[PDB]
Curated annotation (Swiss-Prot), chain A:
Protein name (database record): Carboxysome shell vertex protein CcmL
CDD domains (alphabetical): EutN_CcmL
Subunit structure: Homopentamer. May interact with CcmK2, this occurs at very high CcmK2 concentrations. Interacts with full-length CcmM.
InterPro entries named among the record's database cross-references: CcmL, EutN_CcmL, EutN_CcmL_sf
SUPFAM superfamilies, per database record: EutN/CcmL-like
Keyword line: Bacterial microcompartment, Carbon dioxide fixation, Carboxysome, Photosynthesis
Curated annotation (Swiss-Prot), chains B, C, D, E:
Disulphides: none
Keyword Transmembrane helix included in the entry's annotation: no
Keyword terms of this UniProt record: Bacterial microcompartment, Carbon dioxide fixation, Carboxysome, Photosynthesis
HAMAP family hit by this protein: CcmL
Assembly and binders: Homopentamer. May interact with CcmK2, this occurs at very high CcmK2 concentrations. Interacts with full-length CcmM.
Gene from which this protein is expressed: ccmL
Family stated for the protein in its record: Belongs to the CcmL/EutN family. CcmL subfamily.
CDD domains membership: EutN_CcmL (cd01614)
One GO biological process term: carbon fixation
SUPFAM superfamilies assigned to the protein according to its UniProt record, in alphabetical order: EutN/CcmL-like
Protein name, per record: Carboxysome shell vertex protein CcmL
Localization of this protein: Carboxysome
Organism for this UniProt entry: Thermosynechococcus vestitus (strain NIES-2133 / IAM M-273 / BP-1)
Amino acid sequence: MKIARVCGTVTSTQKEDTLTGVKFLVLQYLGEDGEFLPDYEVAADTVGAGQDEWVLVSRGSAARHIINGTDKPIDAAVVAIIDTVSRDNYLLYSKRT
Amino acid sequence: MKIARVCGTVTSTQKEDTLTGVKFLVLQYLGEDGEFLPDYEVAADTVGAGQDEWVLVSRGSAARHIINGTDKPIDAAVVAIIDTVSRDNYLLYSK
Amino acid sequence: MKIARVCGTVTSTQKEDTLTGVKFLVLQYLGEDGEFLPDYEVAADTVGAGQDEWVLVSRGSAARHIINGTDKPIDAAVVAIIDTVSRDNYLLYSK
Amino acid sequence: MKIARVCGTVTSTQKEDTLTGVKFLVLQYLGEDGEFLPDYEVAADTVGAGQDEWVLVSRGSAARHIINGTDKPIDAAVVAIIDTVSRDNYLLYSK
Amino acid sequence: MKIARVCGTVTSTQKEDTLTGVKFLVLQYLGEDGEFLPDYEVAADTVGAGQDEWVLVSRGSAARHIINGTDKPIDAAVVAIIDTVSRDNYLLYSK
Ligand SMILES: [Mg+2]
């Protein structure tokens, strides 16, 4: 899994039937020390991640193992909203509670 | 998934027998800002996307989960035609 | 999938029993609009693609969905020999 | 598989229900020489790796094949804590 | 599949139980002409390759389709020892 931040959304009305009601978030990947990277993913989200939240994203067939994900032609999903990130025992980031 | 633009097609008469009737689009992947990359994918299309339309592309086994996709040796598929893309707060794209 | 040209062959006499009868082609990926890159793949082929032909290559578990691919440890296969590629209006490639 | 070192942790309380109990480690990938890359992965750990230890990480569907991994939406997992790594007639690392 | 050269080994005693007896090789990916790249993989080896031998590596779920690979959380395996590699119209490698 990669760490990313939620930074937008995609909407579509013409799409595979199996994607009805699927929320598509745009994610910007986060690098060392939380660098905003010039790289992005569009991902399904069944967890309920808000704008600017740090998340874990899973890619490949992992995405189909989200809740009700089985028949969906998705290759990226949000799987967790990040509460904390630590490095070498120091908190680097933490979430509003 | 990645955001891409439909910019071509591919056709083939000598191919795996399971690929009959599968339509292939050439796609160009979006970079950052709203600028496109010189990086392309050929993808199955069952959604019916046309030139210049923006799409979501899924890669790997996800591609086998398009309509009638079971057991087809494909690793890339258009899964949606995009109407809007927002980023940070503003509207980066609108059909 | 990616577009590549067939450019060679690999052979092996010590290998997994699961690769019995598998022909290996070396493929060179097409890059920068229509120029060939210094990036290669080794791929299975049942369709009969020859030197210099253009092909669609599928990677990952898609490769095991070629005819007789089931349960072989292969992660790349030629799935189609390319007749035509069209970018926007014009062609670009035609066999 | 890739070689990485354990450099931190991630926690989460809003997540997929299938991920209850999953320990998430932050891993830094090994680059050239024994230099590490500014490139990180967050991986499940059933083996019980700690800070500064070297591990093998498997990605993709492999990760679901760790003990109890089945049907968890994870795409990276620690699968071994490394004792040694050699390159040629010598040792790059020993615990 | 990628062409790689065997350039070391990894050992581990604390590891997923399904990886008992698995031999791990460190491999370096081949690049431009004969040049080997500054990128590497660790791969399960059930075929028996030695130092400096050239090998085909299969990655992702292919790796679980080696003999008895089925429940192993591995994403890379040596599937063959290369005897020959031919590219365009010259021999690049011949053991
Ligand atoms: Mg032929």
